[PDB]
């Protein structure tokens with residue numbers, strides 16, 4: 142049956158792109174950039 146909900150306790154954030162688990166929310170956010178770092182799809186005046 143169901144025992145846990147979100148892991149055991151530690152706040153580990155995984156990358157929805159590759160699936161890398163990072164022990165830091167800030168660290169990951171920086172890693173995910175590697176996935177969104179491809180050819181220019183369609184930039185804007187921002």
Ligand SMILES: [Zn+2]
Pocket residue numbers: 156157158159160161172173176
């Ligand atoms: Zn990733």
